[PDB]
């Protein structure tokens with residue numbers, strides 16, 4: 137193949153990227169986006185703060201722009217998170233009990249209903265667990281609604297969009313540990329009780345040379361529960377600046393991740409969180425680290441490119 | 449060339465179609481739209497009734513969908529009419545004097561401002577004249593505001609979008625007659641007084657075998673005034689059903705129209721009002737007539753296709 141899209145296509149798998157609609161006006165960005173991927177997801181356009189800035193006041197502008205792009209270029213559309221503790225408008229954080237639940241139910245219904253027929257999969261709930269097991273405590277949803285909020289979100293989503301794949305997404309759950317265990321118990325329980333849940337997303341915000349050795353083993357156990365798995369926000373950061381060795385290691389890491397997916401029949405594909413290091417979110421969140429994506433700040437293919445290519 | 453797009457491209461000219469965003473979900477429609485044209489215009493998505501259904505309440509959804517399509521496929525975007533007597537919401541028709549003028553000025557400003565940078569040209573004023581000379585009398589704009597409404601629309605448009613080509617559009621003005629004469633005097637006056645006006649659009653809703661023999665002569669006289677000309681809503685209707693002779697004549701008519709444009713250096717291009725006869729507006733407006741477009745109800749190329757091809 138000449139592009140990563142063909143490699144993914146030939147493998148019968150998805151290979152997507154996080155889209156920032158405002159970058160489509162940049163020739164090189166659009167060029168790569170058009171030819172290297174077969175799936176697209178909104179980096180921020182479909183989140184709560186972007187879709188419902190004020191209670192009941194929805195703004196689907198940017199969201200629609202992403203959906204239009206997918207439809208116009210023939211790529212699958214991945215919906216990014218309906219329920220998430222981060223990037224939640226203050227008006228929502230100010231609501232409580234009944235009112236807060238009604239707002240959550242309404243947000244899930246309106247957003248899912250609006251993109252019905254466009255998005256193939258949804259990150260219904262994102263990052264509900266805490267590192268080290270258990271539910272996260274700094275979540276407005278966990279605090280105000282308790283344990284049953286996630287089930288309510290999945291049931292509300294299925295009602296608004298009866299055909300979209302409803303997924304649960306999280307990070308630091310790639311390998312077997314206390315967090316992925318709590319997630320495992322949840323998926324197992326939901327499927328046993330018939331709660332609408334079709335997929336599990338593994339963020340995969342990894343560090344160079346530290347790819348979980350039991351990655352595929354972990355992916356497989358979830359797949360055995362009767363659900364699809366997917367690598368949702370892949371990027372492998374390193375200590376900047378980059379050098380030959382760091383890039384060589386990063387290339388081997390990207391390979392391991394894709395191979396793991398290729399080894400699990402239910403792994404739908406891999407989505408890298410962005411196109412070029414020039415726009416990567418890493419440096420702003422992880423001070424001193426970066427160079428996490430496949431294309432550098434000059435839009436030049438890094439050693440990771442060929443690795444992903446042959447991994448497929 | 450293998451497509452009409454390449455023929456138009458090689459000629460350094462535009463060849464567009466009227467887009468109905470709801471048809472992009474139809475495989476054959478999208479396929480033709482993607483490969484046969486290099487310019488696109490909203491059939492109805494950007495009109496007054498679609499963009500401002502209620503005073504001050506703008507709905508750019510469908511409009512944005514058309515703009516996204518153009519940007520995603522690399523086609524030029526033609527903005528279709530800001531001011532038009534038809535398809536005008538009742539709330540507007542109920543306003544008078546000052547209030548009505550402020551509404552017109554606001555509509556022109558908001559819509560032009562929203563698509564600023566996307567649309568290359570605008571039909572600022574559409575169908576302001578009457579068949580037989582003079583201004584049309586069944587227009588809410590002409591009745592409530594008088595003769596100066598058009599100049600006000602062009603000045604308001606230029607302020608909202610300083611770079612878009614501001615055009616005036618009309619039908620039954622293809623050949624030299626009392627209507628095209630009144631239009632000519634207007635363009636001449638506007639250019640002499642420095643009123644913002646860059647182009648003149650000729651609808652070209654013709655009848656089979658009745659193409660104005662002085663078409664190009666008429667196009668040329670307008671071009672000599674220092675403005676660009678364009679065929680905006682081309683379709684050549686016949687009495688249904690169609691037959692070999694009718695299609696043979698239609699093919700020769702399409703050729704004459706394109707050749708006329710090719711003979712006038714300032715003729716920007718040709719826009720056909722639709723893709724297939726299956727969706728053509730003709731039969732609903734002109735009872736008993738149809739088969740006006742290049743593709744039939746089965747999406748099969750008619751004799752007109754090859755004609756347009758060689759005309760370019």
Ligand SMILES: *[C@H]1OC[C@@H](O[C@@H]2OC[C@@H](O)[C@H](O)[C@H]2O)[C@H](O)[C@H]1F
Nearest residue numbers: 154179180262305339341369409417
């Ligand atoms: C996985 O982590 C990445 C996150 O996306 C970022 O959110 C914050 C925003 O400022 C950045 O632009 C994004 O890249 C995504 O939502 C999450 F699920």
Ligand SMILES: *[C@H]1OC[C@@H](O[C@@H]2OC[C@@H](O)[C@H](O)[C@H]2O)[C@H](O)[C@H]1F
Nearest residue numbers: 466491492574617651653681721729
């Ligand atoms: C040139 O004539 C065609 C007209 O477009 C039609 O308007 C009425 C609407 O119901 C049809 O769907 C359209 O095709 C366009 O506005 C005009 F300038």
